[PDB]
Amino acid sequence: LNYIEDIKNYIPFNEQEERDKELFLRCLNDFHDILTRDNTIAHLTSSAFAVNKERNKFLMIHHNIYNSWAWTGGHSDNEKDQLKVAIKELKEETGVKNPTPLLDKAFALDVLTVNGHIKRGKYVSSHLHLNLTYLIECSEDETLMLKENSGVMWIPFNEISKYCSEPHMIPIYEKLINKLKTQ
Amino acid sequence: LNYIEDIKNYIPFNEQEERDKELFLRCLNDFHDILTRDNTIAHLTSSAFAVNKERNKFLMIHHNIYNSWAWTGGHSDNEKDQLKVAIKELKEETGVKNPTPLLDKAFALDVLTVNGHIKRGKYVSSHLHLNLTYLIECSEDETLMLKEGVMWIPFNEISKYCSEPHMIPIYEKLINKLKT
Numbered sequence: 001l002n003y004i005e006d007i008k009n010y011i012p013f014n015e016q017e018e019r020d021k022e023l024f025l026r027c028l029n030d031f032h033d034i035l036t037r038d039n040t041i042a043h044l045t046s047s048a049f050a051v052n053k054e055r056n057k058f059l060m061i062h063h064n065i066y067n068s069w070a071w072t073g074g075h076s077d078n079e080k081d082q083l084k085v086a087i088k089e090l091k092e093e094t095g096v097k098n099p100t101p102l103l104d105k106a107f108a109l110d111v112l113t114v115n116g117h118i119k120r121g122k123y124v125s126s127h128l129h130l131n132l133t134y135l136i137e138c139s140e141d142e143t144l145m146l147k148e149n150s151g152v153m154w155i156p157f158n159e160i161s162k163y164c165s166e167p168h169m170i171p172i173y174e175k176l177i178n179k180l181k182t183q
Numbered sequence: 184l185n186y187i188e189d190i191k192n193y194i195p196f197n198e199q200e201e202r203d204k205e206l207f208l209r210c211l212n213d214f215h216d217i218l219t220r221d222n223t224i225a226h227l228t229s230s231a232f233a234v235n236k237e238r239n240k241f242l243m244i245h246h247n248i249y250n251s252w253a254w255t256g257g258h259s260d261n262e263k264d265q266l267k268v269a270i271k272e273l274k275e276e277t278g279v280k281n282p283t284p285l286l287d288k289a290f291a292l293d294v295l296t297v298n299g300h301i302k303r304g305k306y307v308s309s310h311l312h313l314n315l316t317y318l319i320e321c322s323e324d325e326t327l328m329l330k331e332g333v334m335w336i337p338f339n340e341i342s343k344y345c346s347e348p349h350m351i352p353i354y355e356k357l358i359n360k361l362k363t
């Protein structure tokens with residue numbers, strides 16, 4: 001589903017998504033390009049709410065440097081199909097081969113911060129990531145493998161708060177689970 | 184100095200300031216206004232690099248959050264003179280009586296992030312702070328009292344008080360520019 005209309009028609013799950021969607025629209029209205037990193041202020045990214053058949057676990061990767069786990073995802077980088085971007089990043093970061101989307105439109109919407117940092121000698125200013133999340137199922141039979149991140153693992157929903165140590169990301173993961181739970 | 188002129192004419196100290204200044208200008212171009220929280224994407228804020236007479240201590244404040252120490256500052260909230268904003272915040276947060284600015288224009292420029300959070304029931308989406316820092320001197324003789332801890336922090340141990348990894352290089356920047 002085209003990102004622009006998918007975003008405009010997205011139905012907020014809660015207040016956070018209500019406010020964030022509003023920011024998304026302002027961006028679409030104020031920037032002719034929110035698809036690439038040419039927009040140093042904000043741009044689209046996609047993430048994978050990778051779950052198992054039983055809908056018991058959340059497939060996440062262990063961030064390098066930090067002893068914290070997180071979902072996979074990445075920059076749209078001019079690829080209009082956000083779902084395709086989510087699938088691609090999930091495959092590359094976890095090693096999974098045959099993930100299957102369970103829904104075609106965004107499953108979640110979040111505006112995320114990105115602190116300024118240096119990448120290949122280049123300083124990239126602090127900015128916002130307009131993240132769309134996609135519901136995708138993966139087989140536990142899949143063979144997991146890291147990407148020099150430092151680990152991949154199936155994380156139980158009721159134990160994410162114990163594996164994830166990024167305070168701000170917890171409520172987002174919990175949101176994903178609660179929403180899935182209502183279906 | 185009138186912020187807009189302050190911004191446009193600020194001379195970058197290093198690369199991050201070069202890139203950050205570019206983001207500031209882009210905001211001036213694309214955004215209706217950047218002086219109030221009406222702008223949910225980005226808005227002007229001012230901070231204080233409050234230094235002691237000997238220029239060896241950084242007057243900072245403790246955040247009951249993740250046990251971290253940081254500079255004083257706040258939203259411009261429509262006030263255009265940013266030194267006045269910084270001075271105001273410094274007084275409020277530290278209780279300093281007669282702070283003395285050493286420069287009449289911005290001492291540093293930084294684009295900072297602010298994670299989405301709940302403020303008195305309302306959710307405030309993640310956004311950016313277009314921060315200007317001001318060089319202000321304060322006497323260690325000033326009686327200091329927090330507001331529901333305040334402390335002068337030697338430059339060489341700032342990294343030991345700051346729990347936000349990304350703020351470390353900022354403070355180091357201030358301290359380096361000051362040295363030169």
Ligand SMILES: [Mn+2]
Pocket residue numbers: 037043075114127129
């Ligand atoms: Mn980015």
Ligand SMILES: [Mn+2]
Pocket residue numbers: 220226258297310312
């Ligand atoms: Mn703000």
